[PDB]
């Protein structure tokens, strides 16, 4: 025999990780282990693998740099400490015993260990053009991948309008607070995953790009635009 | 407040540079700065923040490695050192202030800071593929992205011809000088960003595939290359 | 002249090696020398180049990690060290002799070295999904890139397969050898570079992701898998 | 010539600065240009040059991952660039004129850039060892090599003890406050570099390490410390 | 409260360790937490901090390759993350509690956690230099820091010859084994971390340098080395 | 068994060399294979090793970064590539073959392959101090570890003055060649590795420190000075 693997993690980009797996019912150090990477309904890899009895090791080139294999005889433990995670690493890995002669490459496995690196949240804007007539309602869109609310109970969800040549300019600030000096014709509304600017009557002075923002989950991101122009 | 940004930078890939923000108004220490980019149409990124009164930073993940945030309480100023730059960095950067309290993300911005980062001469070649009958007359062209003109005035675009299996042997230098011992059917014209190679009269010997070359500004680059074969 | 460079190098990924360029029929110091890269029918490109006399250098910056040129003035040679080689550096790679002048570039080249760093074995597995009716015959084929015999004269292909929420289980190893306890419904042929597996009866619980691998050339790869699923 | 350089700079480890040489008198690209380093009564070591012609450049080994060299023609202006640095960093940086035919290494100098890291704190603690009778009164001395003044007001300095087998705890902050549980036998004094604490009457529970530190600047740090012990 | 912090580590140099802090007693979110370090009978450093509440985080510039700081707010726990340890890591890892307002550095500390980095064997070859006169008995002393016994039953030291000009020679292996063509007149004894080469009548060929070496634990090492030479 | 080991190399800092080792008088791929490094008179030291059949590597961990292992199968050889190469790379490199069965470890040498990485030139410069009174006559001193003549045929030694709070000045060039404005009491002569300043009547505006300097070898190297002041 049996290969037991510790248990699934959950960690953010950049951060490192060192699973293990135990053997019993055999002699540890009479047998190679390998370590094999599943990716979410994509296929299967080979990482590498060490000889428990004397600690030499075969590297897959592709994942040198990605991890390192080790072995603690007196547990009779395998370990692989992986580093600089990305989105690319999320997948379920597995140990697997190779033959004691060297015909068969993984006659018993672990039952795996799943490492999950979270995904950076996506902000959808629509329209990405939006011509309009002086004096017009208008109304834009912006919806998330994942939750916008934060643990301490706040949505920093802001909308931002810029001009052209010149910077942004805060229009709205936790979903519906209007920044000191904006005019009462912008409103924002919402929750969770879904977010609207409404402007009640547009002026010129209001074409440009607006763009909404999440700063409730590193990293803090930006949504696509929207270009409000005169229509003609 | 105010927020005054360092000028414009025109810089080669690999090249560094330090861009400073100076704040005025306001207790400099009381407020969080963060730094946003922005690349040409494409839209707005966050970089990261620092806290000016204890000096603590927080990091995008994917710009760790590329920025380093600072301050210096003095002159009020707040900094951001951005190295190994690449096309893909040249943008707009802007610095702006976070909220005295935790609601609003951007409340005052700087005027923002272009960074751009030189692009390589591209040389366009055509056509691709150029069938000809022994005797007839035959003209290739060589297109630039910039001027192919260095500051001491002269035009450094050469041709070369590479016969199968052999390495490339040079015929024309410097626009429309012929090589040492190349025959006078081969002739080079043109200035600028467009040029013309010709041969009076093809031979069999004349077979093969044509690079045009730039020697005028670092990194040096070839056309992609045209083949003169016998017709059929 | 006449500049005469090293033999042909066969690598692996991951490999250095470190070409020459010995110069004669003129005096080494008094010219500069430059490399260039020629990918297998893609085009040219300027590595970089070296003053023989002072030992100056000036790189392409896309090249400049990956190369160091230096040279060797008693015996009249220029070298090249190419560094943490991978697939997209197999090329044939070119000294070339600037003008004394400043004129013309390259007039007169190397032979040319070839640099071939070769490729992992790729198994194409067929098809992609299989319905099936239990007591059905059933058949699933696997060819790779190249040879999957090693020096010793054994073929290390095997085949395994994974049920749902488990990990893989051996079936065949060896090419044709069915693992202890695996049902004779299942067989294993084939040899060099294409095989298959059998199943003379499909019973419900064959039903999962068959995956073909190949333990004899690093990296060791697996097949893209096959979904055996009850017809419907 | 005449070649003026930027004015001093003042740094803190792990930032990098981008010095400048203005040339006048001469043709600019007609020139090498050589960079010298001076630390603090300690020599002149050559590090690198630059051929603003071609763009050719030559290091001096020891210092190729540290410096960069590149030149602006239109402004007549060489650039040196420092990356990562140190205390071992801290120098007077010169740039110099190589002669028109090499004859000569450093023919005119620029008046010289004055580049200082600044330095970590040193507390230094007296005595090492103090035995003392029980009941006796004791006195430990802490002095700095810079002031322990914020900018804010206040003077972060501490007091901490180490019992036999346990871990520190916090006796005086802020110079002279007693933290929690603390006894009134304990007292602390002193302002800017020179720091005292006090024991009243020595009992055997106030035996151990103790040890001063400073949370003024960064990085904070701890004196050598003084173990109490008795003289039985 | 109360900090409690995970147990001891024994790892060799190369590998990596997470460490954890629970905190209990408190509000996670609203205190800031620091980290320390020990080295046996050394003295006190600082690492560097975070704040559980928005993430940001401050190092001391010399542990910033080596250190990284993260929380998991659900279960009130801080970590960090120790990579390619050295020798020069082994020490007692301490967290601790920052003041609310920020009045004092460590109110509040961790139990601490041991991490020792395994030291590589010694062996001290004695003498150094060893005249003799032709027919004289020789002995030779080498003595080793940790125990040369392998957890498989055998011992592993040896014993090389180094004549004049040549490279080294087998002598012994396995303590008292002799190799082939060694003369009857060297033998080996001892066990354990004390071993002892005799030489019974010396001879001319005998002289050069003697080696004493332990393949048992990696990094497999050497002694010093005694010089035999004759009392002409 | 015989193991044949390839030719000495003399490197610059910086270099990278790759060396192998042919076996021949028993199955290569039946034994592993050590590497093993000597310094000048300094002692032995274990690299790695590798097992020629199945690929796999042990490194001591000190030369991890330093040095990579590989074989070629059909020519029976084995390889050990060196990078980055400093003056503590410089020693005697061996191959050697591990017993059948492991009982011992060096049982068979090759002859060694020399690796001399290249010495900076050093000048010691004497006196470091030198009182005299005005009018008198001074005498300087400079020798260099290696000799200072240049291929081309030219000695570049020179002779450079710093007055207090000035930058350094020249003052002789190409051993004996005074530059402008330097007063007819200067003198220097030499070859070779010895060299002098000589001033016939000392005034107080000579007084400072001089500095002898050698640009014929890189890294170019200054002397360590010699201060010039009065017997008041």
């Known amino acids: 025999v049996q290969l037991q693997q510790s248990g699934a993690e959950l960690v953010k980009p950049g951060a490192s990780v060192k699973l293990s797996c135990?053997?019993?019912?055999?002699?540890?150090?009479?047998?190679?282990?390998?370590?094999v990477k599943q990716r979410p309904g994509r296929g299967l890899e080979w990482?590498?693998?060490?000889?428990?009895?004397?600690?030499?090791?075969?590297?897959?080139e592709k994942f040198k740099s990605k991890a390192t294999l080790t072995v603690d005889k007196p547990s009779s433990t395998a370990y692989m400490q992986l580093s600089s995670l990305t989105s690319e690493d999320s997948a379920v890995?597995?140990?697997?015993?190779?033959?004691?002669?060297?015909?068969?490459?993984?006659?018993?496995?672990?039952?795996g260990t799943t490492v999950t690196v979270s995904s950076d949240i996506e902000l959808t804007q629509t329209p990405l053009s939006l011509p309009v007539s002086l004096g017009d309602q208008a109304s834009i869109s912006c919806?998330?991948?994942?939750?916008?609310?934060?643990?301490?109970?706040?949505?920093?969800?802001?909308?931002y309008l810029q001009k052209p040549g010149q910077s942004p300019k805060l229009?709205?600030?936790?979903?519906?607070?209007?920044?000191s000096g904006v005019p009462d014709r912008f409103s924002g509304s919402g929750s969770g995953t879904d977010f609207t600017l409404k402007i009640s009557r547009v002026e010129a002075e209001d074409l440009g790009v607006?763009?909404?923002?999440?700063?409730?989950?590193?990293?803090?991101?930006?949504?696509?635009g929207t270009k409000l122009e005169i229509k003609r | 407040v105010q927020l005054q940004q360092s000028g414009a930078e025109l810089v080669k890939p690999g090249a560094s540079v330090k861009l400073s923000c100076?704040?005025?108004?306001?207790?400099?220490?009381?407020?969080?700065?963060?730094?946003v980019k922005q690349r040409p149409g494409r839209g707005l990124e966050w970089?990261?923040?620092?806290?000016?009164?204890?000096?603590?930073?927080?990091?995008?993940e994917k710009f760790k490695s590329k920025a380093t945030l600072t301050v210096d309480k003095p002159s009020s100023t707040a900094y951001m050192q951005l190295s190994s730059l690449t096309s893909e960095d040249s943008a707009v950067?802007?610095?702006?202030?976070?909220?005295?309290?935790?609601?609003?993300?951007?409340?005052?911005?700087?005027?923002g800071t272009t960074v751009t980062v030189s692009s390589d001469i591209e040389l366009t070649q055509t056509p691709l593929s150029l069938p000809v009958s022994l005797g007839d007359q035959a003209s290739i062209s060589c297109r630039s992205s910039?001027?192919?003109?260095?500051?001491?005035?002269?035009?450094?675009l050469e041709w070369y011809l590479q016969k199968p299996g052999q390495s490339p042997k040079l015929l024309i230098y410097?626009?429309?000088n012929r090589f040492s011992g190349v025959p006078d059917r081969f002739s080079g014209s043109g200035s600028g960003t467009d040029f013309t190679l010709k041969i009076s009269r093809v031979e069999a010997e004349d077979l093969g595939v044509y690079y045009c070359?730039?020697?005028?500004?670092?990194?040096?680059?070839f056309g992609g290359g045209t083949k003169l074969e016998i017709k059929r | 002249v006449q500049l005469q460079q090293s033999g042909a190098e066969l690598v692996k990924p991951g490999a250095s090696v470190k070409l020459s360029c010995k110069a004669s029929?003129?005096?080494?110091?008094?010219?500069?020398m430059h490399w260039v890269k020629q990918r297998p029918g893609r085009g040219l490109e300027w590595i970089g180049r070296?003053?023989?006399?002072?030992?100056?250098?000036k790189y392409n910056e896309k090249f400049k990690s990956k190369a160091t040129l230096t040279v060797d003035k008693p015996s009249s040679t220029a070298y090249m060290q190419l560094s943490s080689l991978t697939s997209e550096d197999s090329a044939v790679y070119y000294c070339?002799?600037?003008?004394?002048?400043?004129?013309?570039?390259?007039?007169?080249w190397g032979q040319g070295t070839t640099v071939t760093v070769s490729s992992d074995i790729e198994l194409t597995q067929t098809p992609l999904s299989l319905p099936v009716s239990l007591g059905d015959q059933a058949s699933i084929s696997c060819?790779?890139?190249?040879?999957?015999?090693?020096?010793?004269?054994?073929?290390?292909?095997?085949?395994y397969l994974q049920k749902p929420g488990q990990s893989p289980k051996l079936?065949?190893?060896?090419?044709?050898?069915?693992?202890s306890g695996v049902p004779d419904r299942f067989s294993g042929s084939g040899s060099g570079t294409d095989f298959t597996l059998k199943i003379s009866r499909v019973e419900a619980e064959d039903l999962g992701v068959?995956?073909?691998?190949?333990?004899?050339?690093?990296?060791?790869?697996?097949?893209?898998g096959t979904k055996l699923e009850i017809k419907r | 010539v005449q070649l003026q350089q930027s004015g001093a700079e003042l740094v803190k480890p792990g930032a990098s600065v981008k010095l400048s040489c203005?040339?006048?008198?001469?043709?600019?690209?007609?020139?090498?240009?050589?960079?010298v380093k001076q630390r603090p009564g300690r020599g002149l070591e050559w590090?690198?040059?630059?051929?603003?012609?071609?763009?050719?450049?030559?290091?001096?080994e020891k210092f190729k991952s540290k410096a960069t060299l590149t030149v602006d023609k239109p402004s007549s202006t060489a650039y040196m660039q420092l990356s990562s640095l140190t205390s071992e960093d801290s120098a007077v940086?010169?740039?110099?004129?190589?002669?028109?035919?090499?004859?000569?290494?450093?023919?005119?100098?620029?008046?010289g850039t004055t580049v200082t890291v600044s330095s970590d704190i040193e507390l230094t603690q007296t005595p090492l060892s103090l035995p003392v009778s029980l009941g006796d009164q004791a006195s430990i001395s802490c002095?700095?090599?810079?002031?322990?003044?914020?900018?804010?007001?206040?003077?972060?300095?501490?007091?901490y003890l180490q019992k036999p087998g346990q871990s520190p705890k916090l006796?005086?902050?802020?110079?002279?406050?007693?933290?929690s549980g603390v006894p009134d036998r304990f007292s602390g004094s002193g302002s800017g570099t020179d720091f005292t604490l006090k024991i009243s009457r020595v009992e055997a529970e106030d035996l151990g390490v103790?040890?001063?530190?400073?949370?003024?600047?960064?990085?904070?740090?701890?004196?050598?410390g003084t173990k109490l012990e008795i003289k039985r | 409260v109360q900090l409690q912090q995970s147990g001891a580590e024994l790892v060799k140099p190369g590998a990596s360790v997470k460490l954890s802090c629970?905190?209990?007693?408190?509000?996670?979110?609203?205190?800031?937490?620091?980290?320390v370090k020990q080295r046996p009978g050394r003295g006190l450093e600082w690492?560097?901090?975070?704040?559980?509440?928005?993430?940001?985080?401050?190092?001391?510039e010399k542990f910033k390759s080596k250190a990284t700081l993260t929380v998991d707010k659900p279960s009130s726990t801080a970590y960090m993350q120790l990579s390619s340890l050295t020798s020069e890591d082994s020490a007692v890892?301490?967290?601790?509690?920052?003041?609310?307002?920020?009045?004092?550095?460590?109110?509040?500390?961790?139990?601490g956690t041991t991490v020792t980095v395994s030291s590589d064997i010694e062996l001290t070859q004695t003498p150094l230099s060893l005249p003799v006169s032709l027919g004289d008995q020789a002995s030779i002393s080498c003595?080793?820091?940790?125990?040369?016994?392998?957890?498989?039953?055998?011992?592993?030291?040896?014993?090389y010859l180094q004549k004049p000009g040549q490279s080294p020679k087998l002598?012994?292996?396995?303590?008292?084994?002799?190799?082939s063509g060694v003369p009857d007149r060297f033998s080996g004894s001892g066990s354990g971390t004390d071993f002892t080469l005799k030489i019974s009548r010396v001879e001319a060929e005998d002289l050069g340098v003697?080696?004493?070496?332990?393949?048992?634990?990696?990094?497999?090492?050497?002694?010093?080395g005694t010089k035999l030479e004759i009392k002409r | 068994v015989q193991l044949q080991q390839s030719g000495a190399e003399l490197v610059k800092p910086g270099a990278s060399v790759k060396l192998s080792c042919?076996?021949?008088?028993?199955?290569?791929?039946?034994?592993?294979?050590?590497?093993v490094k000597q310094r000048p008179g300094r002692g032995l030291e274990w690299?790695?090793?590798?097992?020629?059949?199945?690929?796999?590597?042990?490194?001591?961990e000190k030369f991890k970064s330093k040095a990579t292992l590989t074989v070629d199968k059909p020519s029976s050889t084995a390889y050990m590539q060196l990078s980055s190469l400093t003056s503590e790379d410089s020693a005697v490199?061996?191959?050697?073959?591990?017993?059948?069965?492991?009982?011992?470890?060096?049982?068979?040498?090759?002859?060694g392959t020399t690796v001399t990485v290249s010495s900076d030139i050093e000048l010691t410069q004497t006196p470091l101090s030198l009182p005299v009174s005005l009018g008198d006559q001074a005498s300087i001193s400079c020798?260099?570890?290696?000799?200072?003549?240049?291929?081309?045929?030219?000695?570049?030694?020179?002779?450079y003055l710093q007055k207090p709070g000035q930058s350094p000045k020249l003052?002789?060039?190409?051993?004996?060649?005074?530059?402008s404005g330097v007063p007819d009491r200067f003198s220097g002569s030499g070859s070779g590795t010895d060299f002098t300043l000589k001033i016939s009547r000392v005034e107080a505006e000579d007084l400072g420190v001089?500095?002898?300097?050698?640009?014929?070898?890189?890294?170019?190297?200054?002397?360590?000075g010699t201060k010039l002041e009065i017997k008041r």
């Open positions: 070296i003053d023989p006399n002072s030992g100056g250098t």
């Open positions: 070359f730039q020697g005028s500004h670092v990194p040096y680059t």
């Open positions: 070339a002799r600037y003008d004394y002048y400043g004129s013309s570039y390259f007039d007169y």
């Open positions: 410097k626009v429309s």
């Open positions: 029929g003129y005096t080494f110091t008094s010219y500069w």
């Open positions: 910039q001027s192919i003109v260095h500051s001491n005035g002269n035009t450094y």
